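Batch 3, record 17
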Amino acid sequence: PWEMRERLGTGGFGNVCLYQHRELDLKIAIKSLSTKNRERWCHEIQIMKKLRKLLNKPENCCGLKESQILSLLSDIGSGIRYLHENKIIHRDLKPENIVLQDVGGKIIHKIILQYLAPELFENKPYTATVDYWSFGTMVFECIAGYRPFLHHLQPFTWHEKIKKKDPKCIFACEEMSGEVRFSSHLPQPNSLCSLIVEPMENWLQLMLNWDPQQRGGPVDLTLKQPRCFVLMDHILNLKIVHILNMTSAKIISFLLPPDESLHSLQSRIERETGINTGSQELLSETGISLDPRKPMVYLFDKSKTVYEGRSLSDCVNYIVQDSKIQLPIIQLRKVWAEAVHYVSGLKEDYSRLFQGQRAAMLSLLRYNANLTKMKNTLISASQQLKAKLEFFHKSIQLDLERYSEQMTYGISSEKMLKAWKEMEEKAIHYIGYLEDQIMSLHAEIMELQKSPYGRRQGDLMESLEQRAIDLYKQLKHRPSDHSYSDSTEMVKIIVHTVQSQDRVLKELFGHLSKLLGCKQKIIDLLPKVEVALSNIKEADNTVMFMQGKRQKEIWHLLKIACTQ
Amino acid sequence: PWEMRERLGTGGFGNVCLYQHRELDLKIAIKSLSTKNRERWCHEIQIMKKLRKLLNKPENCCGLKESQILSLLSDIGSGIRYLHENKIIHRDLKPENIVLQDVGGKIIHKIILQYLAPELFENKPYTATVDYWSFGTMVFECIAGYRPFLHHLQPFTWHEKIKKKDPKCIFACEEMSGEVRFSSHLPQPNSLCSLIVEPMENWLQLMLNWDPQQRGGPVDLTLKQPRCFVLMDHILNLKIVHILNMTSAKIISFLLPPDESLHSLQSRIERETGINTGSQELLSETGISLDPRKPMVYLFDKSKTVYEGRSLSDCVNYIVQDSKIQLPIIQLRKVWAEAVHYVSGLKEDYSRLFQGQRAAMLSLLRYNANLTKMKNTLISASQQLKAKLEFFHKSIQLDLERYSEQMTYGISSEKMLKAWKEMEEKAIHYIGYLEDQIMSLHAEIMELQKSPYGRRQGDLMESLEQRAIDLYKQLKHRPSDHSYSDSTEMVKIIVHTVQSQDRVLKELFGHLSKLLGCKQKIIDLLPKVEVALSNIKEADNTVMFMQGKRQKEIWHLLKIACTQ
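Prediction for the assembled complex:
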């Protein structure tokens, strides 16, 4: 019962049809007359047996998340490694050929005119640099989202035009005048760490080499790779950790050497941020300060309390000044894509600030749980302590009685009297006060639990972003209007995002500093708790000392009476 | 600076003007040419020196609250007692003459053609029965709200018509046919307890006696009053207490003899309700069960758990069946006033049911507070108890040691061994389990705190009552339409009041029974708590017994060693 659903796509002989078993629900596709191409169909059988939907989503109009593209380059990079092992030059590297797999929640990227390399465009013989070229071209059309050099240019003049320029220049930005800034550098509104960008820049300079026989790296034979694959292995080895300094609203990647301690990294924090090491509080996504003898992280400054804390496109700054800049539809789509990139970045910003708030919160709850357990421990030792003073007092007074009849026998030195008196004076000298500070501070903690949050306003700004991208979608349904209308409602969304960001930021900075002061009070409460606990237990053990010491002279002087 | 505000009313010479000091804000009125009436103005000076706003409020269209009218009859009754002391026949007893005073929150009623008695209507000589007649007439026009006999009748035919009827008949209901049911009984849709009504019925039979020289009671000289004032003193002495049986949704007044115990009243509860005495739970407005050795009360049945639990006007029942009963404006105002009386009564019903809910709630909180204090007491005695087993165990084993060297002297009976062994076996044999039931049941109590309430729906039905009385107000702005429209929206308000009353009633019956089961569990938890507490303290005192008993043989056998 393999019921036909709607098709996947179009084959070379027909339509790539998606069908499904009715009982088992096994979504299996089918690929649907020259015996050369049906023979190559059997070649497709023997060799196979032996994403652009996401890119066309207007939310990712400036491109994707960086590390997701890194997983893409790992997957499809290992695939094209695998095919150039197998003497297979795919020639067709496009996100149309990349239908995802959501196994384990992780997207796996497999393979089934903008990618037509000039050695396949003009010549019938070719090499692996078609897939090198269309690979890196596909990668940058995931990074920026559009064509790496001369987007919206006719392919004929596109191949000849780049066939006559500098191959190191990996980005051609064509202006409104037609004068093109042929650049070897990537565009700025991206989600990318430059530490990864520059080896990827050199890698694209290997990829966008127009001459095929110099395109690709020279094959380094110890690792059996061109320099392209070696640089891709460097990118798979660039192990960094992002740290948001919550006291500066800045996210910094720190490169991790494979052997550096966390403490030497703390020295790097003190160099790169200026915050002193012992006051560097590193909170995890569950707010856990790692053991520094081990090798987003939320930097807090343990000494400071009150924490103080822009569109790089100046054309959108012109729109915020005057939305009536009469842009063509290309610049309208461009600058609106920039604005969506901007406010989206704002959303992720206060999103992770919410997360740092929660890390502070749960860490605070850990300290409270510790403090309550220590508290009830002090309760136990307190009660038993006062009972020990109690019975020890009674044993003192009865032994004073019976010792007094021993002094009616007149048979002992009176140092037992003053001895047991000084014992009893020790029993005098020994609470709930700091416990009242505990329950009161706890009440303040519950108040910090009940204090309001502004995440609904982040949902409002989120829906504002939804409106702005709905507008950009209205530039995507008709880019054929060539309108020149303003973007005043865009600036409306912009300044409400500004002000609401200020409100939520200052609220959770105040909440933040309250958690900081209360946590600080907890750290103040702990050593007095523990020292007083030690005084309790030492007092107990002295009660046992003068206990068995008094009973000690009881049996010894007893046996002196047994002597003669 | 006594600034003139708007007037109070109209004087005999002008307008009774209300004015006010600007600094001190002292609202003082002024009363504003025959020298006989200016001479009687000076008589008004010498004698004075020596409410209908509420009745015209359409909310009280069927009349007022009973006890408020009782306070009215006490105030104005003592005033007319005071004037008939002073040879003053006021002749003018109307709520126009009753401007209230809100001192202490309590309304004080003072004195400044429907009340024209036939001895003042027809004759120039008169007596105190003008004020007796207009007094009781004013009282019943506070009770029902309108004229006691033949309302909307022209005064000329009104005086002659009642001048020819039975004076014991204290209510003339004129029908639509003109045939009048001259009744000696009050109308039914009132807020009145019949225990007070029948002496007030006989009192009105004294008041509505048409012949003045038989109007009023015969003057009983030991108390120096007519029988009218004596009956009013009986009404001021009728001391009852309302009990709502929450298990039957019935409010019963119980007459209190001046010396009856509360327990004999509990026997009256068992007779008048059928609920057994020891299971009669009487909850106050703070839910306090009174000490029964003392002399609204919320009856609960301590044994039962799930508590199961109409328009007397049949014309409004006809409207609920068919609102298109085409009534004249008189019957429209009548029956709508009845409906407002009905739903208003519903509002007060579930209002006091909310109150019984709260009494159950706060009583429950009292039991929890008691239980937690007993709990932490058991914690204290538990810790000190286990410490006492602890040190007593150590004192046992060291005395076993030193007793064993006494048996190397061979000088004691071995019954000290087995003695201290059986002591130690007693120390073995002695918690948090019922405490876990306490904290768990407490969690259930917090859940009963967080369970939802339906008082907002009572506010909805309240606003439904506001709409229905807004409609009746639209019969009061124009009773001159003589419409015959339906009351379908009235029945809408009626059935939504029905169903919402069912929902809130069943919700708080379920909440109710949950409080009943949880409170029941608390009463189950208490005796095991206290008995176990007694076992703790007895165990302690035995620890002291074998403590000073072991030390007792220590000093005695010690002095046996001192002997020879």
